[PDB]
Structures are given as structure tokens and as C-alpha cells.
Amino acid sequence: PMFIVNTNVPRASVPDGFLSELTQQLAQATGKPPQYIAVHVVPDQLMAFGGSSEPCALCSLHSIGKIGGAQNRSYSKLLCGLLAERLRISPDRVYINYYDMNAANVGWNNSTFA
Amino acid sequence: PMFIVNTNVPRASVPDGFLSELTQQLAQATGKPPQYIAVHVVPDQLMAFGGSSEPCALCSLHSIGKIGGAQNRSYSKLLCGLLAERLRISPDRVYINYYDMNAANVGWNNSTFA
Amino acid sequence: PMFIVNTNVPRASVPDGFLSELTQQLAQATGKPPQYIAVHVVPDQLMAFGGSSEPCALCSLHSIGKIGGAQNRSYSKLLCGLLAERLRISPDRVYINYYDMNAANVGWNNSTFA
Ligand SMILES: O=C(O)c1cccc(Oc2cccc3nc(-c4cn(-c5ccc(O)c(F)c5)nn4)ccc23)c1
Ligand SMILES: O=C(O)c1cccc(Oc2cccc3nc(-c4cn(-c5ccc(O)c(F)c5)nn4)ccc23)c1
Numbered sequence: 001p002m003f004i005v006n007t008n009v010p011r012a013s014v015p016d017g018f019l020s021e022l023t024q025q026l027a028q029a030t031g032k033p034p035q036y037i038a039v040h041v042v043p044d045q046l047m048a049f050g051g052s053s054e055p056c057a058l059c060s061l062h063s064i065g066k067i068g069g070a071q072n073r074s075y076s077k078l079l080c081g082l083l084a085e086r087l088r089i090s091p092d093r094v095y096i097n098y099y100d101m102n103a104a105n106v107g108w109n110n111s112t113f114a
Numbered sequence: 115p116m117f118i119v120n121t122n123v124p125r126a127s128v129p130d131g132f133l134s135e136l137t138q139q140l141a142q143a144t145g146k147p148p149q150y151i152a153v154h155v156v157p158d159q160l161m162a163f164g165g166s167s168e169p170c171a172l173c174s175l176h177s178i179g180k181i182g183g184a185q186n187r188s189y190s191k192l193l194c195g196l197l198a199e200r201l202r203i204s205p206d207r208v209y210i211n212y213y214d215m216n217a218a219n220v221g222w223n224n225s226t227f228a
Numbered sequence: 229p230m231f232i233v234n235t236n237v238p239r240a241s242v243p244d245g246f247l248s249e250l251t252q253q254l255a256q257a258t259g260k261p262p263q264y265i266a267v268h269v270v271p272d273q274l275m276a277f278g279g280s281s282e283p284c285a286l287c288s289l290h291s292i293g294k295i296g297g298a299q300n301r302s303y304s305k306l307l308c309g310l311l312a313e314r315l316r317i318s319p320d321r322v323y324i325n326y327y328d329m330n331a332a333n334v335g336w337n338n339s340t341f342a
């Protein structure tokens with residue numbers, strides 16, 4: 001899986017270990033092996049939510065399967081929880097786009113997963 | 115909705131009020147409540163369009179509904195118009211990816227919209 | 229087409245000519261005209277692959293057509309090869325999301341491609 005979070009929170013508020021924490025939690029939530037989970041945090045961004053510059057986050061999770069109604073609700077609770085705890089971002093100022101990707105549309109290691 | 119614009123235009127050349135203007139314009143164009151519009155501008159980027167580095171922009175709009183043939187044509191004119199006036203980027207050096215997202219695939223406030 | 233690469237490799241390690249190289253290698257791989265290829269490189273990123281912060285890259289390619297099983301395998305070999313050669317990133321730490329976009333959902337030059 002690939003997880004990306006963009007936020008207006010400064011880099012200084014991103015703790016040591018945050019990328020590992022995201023990796024960790026996503027591995028268990030998805031049941032995917034952690035060595036295949038990529039994570040990307042992008043702080044200090046010029047962004048607004050509802051026209052307000054208070055802390056917010058715009059995120060994506062791409063996965064081959066393990067994407068669905070109930071699963072995405074559980075990921076949103078998990079990710080909003082972490083963003084609130086570690087970055088002090090209110091859950092109602094977080095958006096996450098989920099993508100169930102076809103294996104043929106994911107490149108890795110000179111090939112694709114199909 | 116979520117709107118992102120990535121550009122090689124420098125930060126200092128992004129005029130003040132730009133995020134608020136995008137927020138309001140996207141609200142009226144989509145008919146979505148402005149409270150729920152998120153906008154993100156990423157200046158100073160290392161990018162090329164047709165292999166040249168004159169000003170350009172790479173954008174995306176995600177929405178649950180309000181996406182379609184005629185709407186996307188209208189959005190593209192509106193957004194290219196704004197980028198041209200504010201950031202001085204020619205419309206022929208702007209791309210916008212539109213995504214009609216399923217409510218189940220959009221996380222927010224500890225849950226999804228489904 | 230639109231190609232984005234985000235990496236933790238430092239900006240100084242991105243060769244002059246890299247954006248041009250991407251543009252023309254993709255032009256030939258996809259058969260799309262290079263004047264319509266947009267490329268975006270984002271160095272110095274906070275990211276991990278498998279929880280490790282060794283060099284890695286997270287990429288996407290959006291195109292109207294020229295996306296499929298064999299083509300995407302070929303693009304992956306090509307892009308991993310380029311990233312290995314120029315950025316010294318191992319192919320097992322590269323991910324590429326491929327998107328076959330509907331022409332109605334790609335904005336350009338005040339309209340869409342539909
Ligand atoms: O075949 C084996 O022996 C073996 C042993 C250990 C691990 C292994 O790899 C895997 C096992 C199970 C699910 C796996 N899922 C993935 C996987 C990767 N994605 C994924 C990554 C990035 C994206 O941008 C994306 F859209 C999807 N989604 N799932 C990769 C490897 C897996 C395979
Ligand atoms: O339920 C209510 O009582 C109520 C009252 C006031 C406002 C309200 O919120 C809404 C009303 C109508 C459409 C709405 N659409 C959205 C909405 C959000 N997206 C959206 C946001 C981010 C993305 O990445 C994405 F793919 C889609 N697309 N639509 C949010 C709130 C809405 C709901």
C-alpha cells in the first residue's frame with residue numbers, strides 16, 4: 001500500500017517515528033506485509049479546509065484490495081486518531097481518498113503486481 | 115471536495131487571498147458547501163510541461179458527484195481562467211485530473227461519507 | 229500524460245536534464261507527443277518504504293489510453309531503470325500508480341479532451 005498525508009502543520013510537529021507508526025498501524029489494519037507499505041508525509045503546506053487555515057490534512061491510501069465500506073471506515077478512524085494524537089489535527093479537518101487499485105496498475109520492482 | 119494545484123510558480127508569486135478565492139469559486143461551481151471545500155497550493159515545484167519550464171500547473175479535483183462531461187469543461191475554463199489571472203500561467207500549460215469519488219472511498223471525521 | 233515522482237533523494241542528487249529525460253523517455257514508451265507530457269519531480273521528501281528511510285520513490289502516471297497489462301510492465305521496467313541509473317534508487321523501493329483516465333476527466337486549455 002501507499003499512504004500520503006499532506007498538511008499545513010509544520011515539520012517540527014511531526015514526531016520522530018511517525019513514518020514507522022503509520023507503516024505499522026497500516027500493516028495491521030490492512031493485513032498487508034509492512035515491508036510493502038510506503039508512507040509519505042508532507043508538512044508545511046499552503047492549504048485550507050472550509051476556508052480556514054487551522055491545522056488540516058489531505059490524504060490518500062492506495063491498495064490492491066483491502067478497500068471497502070467497512071474497511072475504509074476503520075482506516076479513517078485509525079488515521080484520524082493518529083493525526084489528532086501526533087499532529088493535533090482535528091478529525092473533522094481531515095480528508096482521505098481511498099483507491100482500490102487493480103494489480104496491473106501498480107508498478108514495483110521492474111514489473112507490476114498482476 | 116478537494117482541490118490541489120502544483121506549480122513551478124514561486125511562493126512569493128502566489129497572491130494573498132488565493133486559497134480563499136479557490137475555496138469560494140469551487141463552492142459555487144460545484145454547488146457544494148464552502149465549509150467542506152479543501153484547497154491546497156504547492157508552489158516552487160520542479161516541473162516541466164512539454165519539456166519546458168515556463169509556468170505550468172498540474173491539478174486535481176476530487177468530489178462525490180458534481181463531476182461529468184459538461185461540468186468538467188466548465189470547471190476547466192473557470193480554473194484555467196483563475197490560474198491565468200492570478201499565477202500568470204497559460205491555459206495550455208495546465209492539466210486538471212477530475213475524480214468522481216464514491217462516498218465510501220472518502221474518509222472524513224473518523225468515518226466515511228457513505 | 230502526467231508523470232509525478234516523489235522521493236527522499238536530495239535535490240542536489242537530481243541531475244540537470246532529469247525532467248527532460250523523463251519527458252522524452254515517456255514520449256517514446258507511450259507514443260504520446262512530448263509537447264503534451266508533463267513531468268514533476270519532488271525531492272527531499274519525508275518518506276519510508278517498508279518503514280526504512282533508504283532511497284525510495286513513489287510515482288504516478290496518468291494517461292488517456294496507452295495504459296494496460298503489458299504496457300504498464302514495460303513502463304515499470306523503464307522507470308525503475310531510470311530511477312536506478314540517475315537517482316541510485318533500488319527498483320524494489322519504487323512504486324508507480326498507473327491511471328487510465330477518461331478524456332472527459334482530464335482538463336486542459338479551458339476545456340477537456342472529451
Ligand atoms: O509471494 C510471496 O511469497 C510473498 C511473501 C511475502 C510478502 C509478499 O507480498 C505480498 C503479500 C500479500 C499482499 C501484498 N500486497 C502488496 C500490495 C501493494 N499494494 C500497493 C502498493 C502501492 C500502491 O500505490 C498501490 F496502489 C498498491 N497493494 N498491495 C504487495 C505485496 C504483498 C509476497
Ligand atoms: O447532513 C447535513 O445535515 C449537512 C448539513 C450541511 C452541510 C452538509 O454537507 C454536505 C452537503 C451536501 C454535499 C456535501 N458534499 C460533501 C463532499 C465532500 N466531498 C469530497 C471531499 C474530499 C474528497 O477528497 C472527495 F473525493 C470528495 N465531495 N462532497 C461534503 C459535505 C456535503 C451536510
Ligand SMILES: O=C(O)c1cccc(Oc2cccc3nc(-c4cn(-c5ccc(O)c(F)c5)nn4)ccc23)c1
Pocket residue numbers: 209210211229230260261264290291292293329334340341342
Ligand atoms: O484529441 C484532442 O482533443 C487533442 C487536442 C489537441 C492536441 C492533441 O494532441 C494529441 C495527439 C495524440 C495524443 C494526445 N494525447 C494527449 C494526452 C494527455 N493526456 C493526459 C494528460 C494529463 C493527465 O493528467 C492525464 F490523465 C492524461 N493523456 N493523453 C494529449 C494530446 C494528444 C489532441
